[PDB]
Design an enzyme around this catalytic site. Sequence first.
Site, PDB file in Angstrom:
ATOM      1  N   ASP A 126       0.637  -1.332   0.054  1.00  0.00           N
ATOM      2  CA  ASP A 126      -0.016  -0.051   0.073  1.00  0.00           C
ATOM      3  C   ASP A 126       0.854   1.365  -0.175  1.00  0.00           C
ATOM      4  O   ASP A 126       1.784   1.423   0.753  1.00  0.00           O
ATOM      5  CB  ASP A 126      -0.990  -0.108   1.012  1.00  0.00           C
ATOM      6  CG  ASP A 126      -1.941   1.243   1.181  1.00  0.00           C
ATOM      7  OD1 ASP A 126      -2.683   1.565   0.208  1.00  0.00           O
ATOM      8  OD2 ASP A 126      -2.130   1.849   2.162  1.00  0.00           O
TER       9      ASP A 126
ATOM     10  N   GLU B 277       1.673  -0.002  -4.688  1.00  0.00           N
ATOM     11  CA  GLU B 277       0.938   1.057  -5.132  1.00  0.00           C
ATOM     12  C   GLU B 277       1.778   2.363  -4.996  1.00  0.00           C
ATOM     13  O   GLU B 277       2.120   2.523  -3.848  1.00  0.00           O
ATOM     14  CB  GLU B 277      -0.346   1.235  -4.041  1.00  0.00           C
ATOM     15  CG  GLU B 277      -1.359   2.435  -4.412  1.00  0.00           C
ATOM     16  CD  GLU B 277      -2.145   2.878  -3.341  1.00  0.00           C
ATOM     17  OE1 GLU B 277      -2.177   2.161  -2.136  1.00  0.00           O
ATOM     18  OE2 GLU B 277      -2.376   4.198  -3.302  1.00  0.00           O
TER      19      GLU B 277
END
Lengths: 557, 557
Positions: free
Chosen positions: B252, B283
């Site tokens: 993330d 990400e």
Amino acid sequence: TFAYKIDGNEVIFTLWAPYQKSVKLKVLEKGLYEMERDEKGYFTITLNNVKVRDRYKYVLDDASEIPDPASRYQPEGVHGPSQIIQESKEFNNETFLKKEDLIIYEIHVGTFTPEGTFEGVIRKLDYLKDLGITAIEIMPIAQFPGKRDWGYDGVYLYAVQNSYGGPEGFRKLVDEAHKKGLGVILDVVYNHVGPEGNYMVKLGPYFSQKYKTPWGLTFNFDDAESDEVRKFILENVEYWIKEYNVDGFRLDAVHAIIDTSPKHILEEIADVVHKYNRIVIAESDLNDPRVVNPKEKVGYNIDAQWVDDFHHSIHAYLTGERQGYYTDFGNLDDIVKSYKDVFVYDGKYSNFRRKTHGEPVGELDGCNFVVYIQNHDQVGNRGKGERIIKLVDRESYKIAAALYLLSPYIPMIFMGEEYGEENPFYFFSDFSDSKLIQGVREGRKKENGQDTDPQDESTFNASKLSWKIDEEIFSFYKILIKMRKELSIACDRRVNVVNGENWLIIKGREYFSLYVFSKSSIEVKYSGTLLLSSNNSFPQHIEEGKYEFDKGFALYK
Amino acid sequence: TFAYKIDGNEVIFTLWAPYQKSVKLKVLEKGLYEMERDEKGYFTITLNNVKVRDRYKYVLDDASEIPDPASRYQPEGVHGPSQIIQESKEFNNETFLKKEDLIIYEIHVGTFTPEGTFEGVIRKLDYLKDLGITAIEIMPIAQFPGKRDWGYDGVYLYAVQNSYGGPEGFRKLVDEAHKKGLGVILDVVYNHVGPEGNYMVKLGPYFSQKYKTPWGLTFNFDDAESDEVRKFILENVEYWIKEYNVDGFRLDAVHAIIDTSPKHILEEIADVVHKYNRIVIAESDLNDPRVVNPKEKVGYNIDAQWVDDFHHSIHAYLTGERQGYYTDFGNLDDIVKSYKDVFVYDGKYSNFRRKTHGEPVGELDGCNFVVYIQNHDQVGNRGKGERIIKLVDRESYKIAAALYLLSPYIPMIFMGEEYGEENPFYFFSDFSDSKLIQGVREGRKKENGQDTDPQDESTFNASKLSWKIDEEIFSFYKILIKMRKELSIACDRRVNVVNGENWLIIKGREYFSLYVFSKSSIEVKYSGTLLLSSNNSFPQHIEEGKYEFDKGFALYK
């Protein structure tokens, strides 16, 4: 393009003011005007009536008058109106300053010459030249508050110091040294700004909020409008180069410069400089090669970087010092590794930072780093700016000197040091806001125990150099500096190093050197002729065998 | 080594607690003990009486009981006592998961299956397999607060979700998919932590104070003790790999991971993973190649990275959307460049961030990036988690689908999407501290206008998938997914791309494809056989010439 720009008979007034809705030019004598707010946030005006070596303040929304942060020069205070000046415009496609021949003289125009100005420092050129120094490094001349500061509260990156003379002076200073065949190197601060007279803050976002350095916070190179500020800075170096034919830059504590961009602002700057074929050096705590690293290796390029690691090893060794950083060293072994592997923290545990510091420097010449036994910082923040003379046996002080100037590194002498200066370098400020002239106090006081209330002329002048030559020390220096050249000792890290319990012998390409900190026996493995000794106990023509030596330093061939 | 470690009959209790002076093991049934404080700050004990699938709390100085942040599992709340579990120990030297064959199924165990668990998701394997999906990506299973969360408040990096089943379950889930020949990919959060049950904060410095992300602040990888925390994390990935034979990781918002060290923690992790021959995806908002970049190029290595740039171009194009980021795009041209130059922001001006975003992706295969038309974020934070079905003409929704799965990139399907799901994906929380269950409210409310009080089962369940198949959509998908394989369309960026005012034709290695968003004339430059169309208006055997087409998508050969 940020301050002003004299065309033919006409002049512009750029002005980054995102946060502003209405901005007003205000020639102090002439009148007040309305800047052409561009969507990007750049107010602006154009003049021709002007030529005027006029003062001016930008008057914003809030109904406040302020000065051009790209102030070419702030005649009065750091609240003085900014001012028009000429377009020096001329400089040259280069620097005579070749990297190898590099002897740096760190100077502080203020406490230097009793005049304490460029003029002051101009008087010493030939002296300097005499010394053998290959170039001069000026401490920050970025308009700070008051008249008494190291210059680390510079709050006007574009404006040349009032007191120190200013512009024409600084102007002259270079044109001078230039003739004397001396190189000048400005040490500029891009990782932060002055706690007084800072009006960036109301014009828009110049400084990131993401981060917080120690001394406040760095600028914004990352977020919201980075674009602009990052230009500010970048133009700033260009200025120096053209408006003052400056020879190089010295960057303060780069590691407070935070960038996440694909292209680190440093590398951004380096390029600007190397573009004009000038030199860059940077103060970096991070034992990271990245900085000084080459383009092929995806390094920022920066020509050279300071290696406190050197200093420290030596210092704590000579002094029985173990405070703060001194705790990471204080040992012989350190001295050698630093001697052969630039960093003492090559990726190992600093109890000092309870971390795993630095990492292996490449196969970079000794010239990517710059060594010293003294500098404003190391003296300056002691609580009583003790010079190193005040903490070491005389023979030591001589030895040390040798150590550093005899390195492949890039030896830089603090001011005074060469002639045996004992005055101290104090922490001094010249603030005005009560809370400043106070916070500071418990600061320097709580930080370093400094008693000398920095906001006291006392503390100030007491740091002014006492030109009291000591020809012993003074002589030595010149010699060293001289032998170094002779010997071709610079940059070259192809060295052989030994030490015993208290001694140390260092072969090089053209010689050997002997460091003995305590009478002891040395199995000197070579024959050479005494080239220079710290003592007299030294054997003009040496040969290989055991010999007992006395605390001292000797240099063969 | 951080939680506990069952030896033979004996077990250890490591515990990073710099700030602590006295720490006490406390088997809930057995007793309370005293940890062996090591200078580094690691309290510690050794047990043998234990085997006990026992709960335990660490009781510190302050006189507070707390749970092992490396909690293997938190039976009760995020305040439950930590607990002993077995040593899964077994896993394999690899992943069957070859990069090219990569179809990702983003899943959210909770709102997925009406059971909302691994068991639940285990029931769909063969379904999934049916679909053709090459692997599964689980959203964060890091013990969060409550039972209803996307899982972005995970506050127990080591402890497997209660509700979702937990350990044995998650355990089972993989061993299952493993047999079905399906790959599992855990999406872990290392850039921050949960706003509830976070007791790092009292054990010492786990998180840097230098910085501040948006969602609080990242950990400390730089300063004071980075050393430890950086290990925490690094061990954390190792766990997953061995204690659960996990197939890969999905990181993330890496760009909230701040490191200045010579070795970026990312690169640090990548290595851990590639060490076990597993895969990593991240990400990253920063249009920086660095990440996915290779070792030779001094890149972090990370196997692949998400490219929202793709999405956006398409989305705002199909929707007349221009809000927030949508403002940077909304155009055809965007769609193509993204199609040929991974990033639409290759180093250009985002008015969105009023900055100069991204920079040129290399010559990296399409497989360094992963495209999608949908994901929890893109649906999730809408204010009303509208799926994309709800904003586009049916033909469109089909076209899009094609666009993305037909890319050299690494197509990943959100859950639902394949079968034509219309339910929404809502922002839901399951906090307990009043101020939380509140701040949140004006948050989601002020941020995205979400009305659905996230702290309401309503908002929750309403996001649960309505397994209401639509064989039109559903069919298509399978096909696409199928053709892709057939065609060998993956990774390969050797493409030829055209578009007219409203159309677009894309040659590839084994075909062409036609996208027409509005009846128009196309000078089709090639002859191929209809392989798949969105409509019927499509000419089984095509030839080169002008032809008028109807809003639709057709695929040749």
